[PDB]
Amino acid sequence: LSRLDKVEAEVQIDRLITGRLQSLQTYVTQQLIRAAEIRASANLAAIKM
Amino acid sequence: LSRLDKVEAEVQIDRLITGRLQSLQTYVTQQLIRAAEIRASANLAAIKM
Amino acid sequence: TNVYADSFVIRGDEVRQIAPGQTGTIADYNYKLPDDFTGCVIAWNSNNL
Amino acid sequence: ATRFASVYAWNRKRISNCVADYSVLYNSASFSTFKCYGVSPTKLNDLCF
């Protein structure tokens, strides 16, 4: 944004957006699977209690 | 398709395909995780039965 | 919905500025085209007149 | 400069420890081609090298 004008910048920013959004979706998917694993362990611990 | 010639259209359509396919993969991944949660709950209900 | 015909004369060199996302003598101070412009830039030699 | 080098013997004048104004080089527009790669012709005035 300090260095390219809008129509040339927009291509570069769309690359950054795409890869950062794919990093976020990867994080949140792995957190949904970790959340299920801890949920199972919490259910087990409530049974053991 | 009513407005751009084929070769200029193909770039735009490839953008739409990319975003729609990423939306579908996100839906189906969240459904696989929800399916695991409901599967665990069904197994528990079969045990309680 | 409407059509607007914008009409002017320039050097056959500086014609290269008349496109969306451009800068230069004509683009900067005379006629600027928006980044999401829909339209046709039609131009032809007039050294006969 | 009065007379240029031959392009087989292209000459690299180092410019450094100085204050520039590339709007003079651009907007004066005695030129004809001005392709700026990796930097915008406009934001070029807002930047240090």
CA separation for the pair C36, B17 (Å, rounded): 21
Q: State the Cα–Cα distance between residues A36 and A7, nearest whole angstrom.
A: 44
Q: Locate A22 and state its tokens.
A: 């794919």
Q: How far is CA B3 from the centre of its chain?
A: 29
- A7, C21 in Cβ contact below 8 A? yes
Q: Dig out the tokens for D16 from the structure.
A: 């450094």
- Would you say A11 and B11 are in contact if contact means Cβ atoms under 8 Å apart? no
Fill in the DSSP letter of residue D4: P
Q: Give the minimum alpha-carbon distance from A25 to chain B in angstroms, rounded to a whole number.
A: 8
Beta carbons of D34 and C25 less than 8 Å apart: no
Question: Which residues from chain D sit within 8 angstroms of residue A5, using beta carbons?
Answer: 40-43
Helix (H) or strand (E) holding A17: helix A6-48
Alpha-carbon torsion, ordered D7, D26, C10, B8, to 10 deg: 80
CA B47, CA B49: separation in Å to the nearest integer?
5
Q: Which among D34, D25, D40, B15 has a CA at the least distance from the CA of C21? A: D40
Q: How was this structure determined?
A: cryo-EM
Q: In sequence order, what are the residues at sequence separation of 6 or more whose Cβ sits closer than 8 angstroms to the Cβ of residue D45?
A: D21, D22, D23
Nearest CA in chain D to C24: D27
Helices A6-48 and B6-48, packing angle to 10 deg: 10
DSSP 8-state assignment for residue D6: P
Resolution of this structure in Å: 3.3
Residues of A in contact with D43 (CB under 8 A): 2-5
Judged by 3 or more CB pairs under 8 A, whether A touches B is yes
Q: Please tell me which of the candidates A25, A32, A40 has its beta carbon nearest to residue B40.
A: A40
| D1 and chain C in contact, CB less than 8 A | no
